């Protein structure tokens, strides 16, 4: 065939840190189904949101929002534990169906998106031109986030491990940590990846007695 229907922009959802995680690649012939499993950003999280996006940018904010819904009734468990199956399916007439199911609870939710939604051709071109042009920055962003999320996590973990102990060591151990949890807390707010890792490391240091 010399011609076929495709979905012209990548399709996905928003993941922790406000990054887009793709789910159907641009220029994928339709119809088509894809599924991917996800978890929860943090501990004891009973609900998630699924924000459906169209585009080629690493910033979820930079892409086109097709919609959203919540998935509730998830059993508060530790982060990474729940298994939330998300599925994007585009039928032959370009209708997009997005489902999310929590494998444990069996809780499921759904949204239907009209083929005509999203970005027009002019807008399509631009996206693509824009994505390419900002490739370096989108990369930088992505990693920034990957670091930010490791840190967020180190954060709750370190806090969980301390306020977990009694012989919190010479409390001088405890104190160095609190003073390092701050530095990190603050570093995190920045856009500078190195500074985050650099505080993660200092934190990793004055935590010997807690890592043990």
């Amino acid at each position: 065939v010399l011609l076929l229907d495709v979905t012209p922009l990548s399709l996905g959802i928003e993941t922790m840190g406000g990054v887009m995680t793709t789910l159907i690649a641009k220029n994928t012939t339709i119809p088509t189904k894809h599924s991917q499993v996800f978890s929860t950003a943090e501990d004891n999280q009973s609900a998630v949101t699924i924000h459906v996006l169209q585009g080629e940018r690493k910033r979820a904010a930079d892409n086109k929002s097709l919609g959203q819904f919540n998935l509730d009734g998830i059993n508060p468990a530790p982060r990474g534990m729940p298994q939330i199956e998300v599925t994007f399916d585009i039928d032959a007439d370009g209708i997009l169906h997005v489902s999310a199911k929590d494998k444990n609870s069996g809780k499921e939710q759904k949204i239907t998106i009209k083929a005509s939604s999203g970005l027009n051709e002019d807008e399509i071109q631009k996206m693509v031109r824009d994505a390419e042009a900002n490739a370096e920055a989108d990369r930088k962003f992505e990693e920034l986030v990957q670091t930010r999320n490791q840190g967020d996590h180190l954060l709750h973990s370190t806090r969980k491990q301390v306020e977990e102990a009694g012989d919190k060591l010479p409390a001088d151990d405890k104190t160095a940590i609190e003073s390092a949890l701050t530095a990190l807390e603050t570093a995190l707010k920045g856009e500078d990846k190195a500074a985050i890792e650099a505080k993660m490391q200092e934190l990793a240091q004055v935590s010997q007695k807690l890592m043990e």
Binding site: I13, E14, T15, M16, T21, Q36, V37, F38, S39, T40, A41, E42, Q45, A47, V48, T49, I50, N70, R79, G80, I84, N149
Partner: peptide, 9 residues
């Protein structure tokens, strides 16, 4: 591998 979804409002 494994991605992470955040909390609603």
């Amino acid at each position: 591998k494994l991605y992470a979804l955040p909390r609603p409002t």
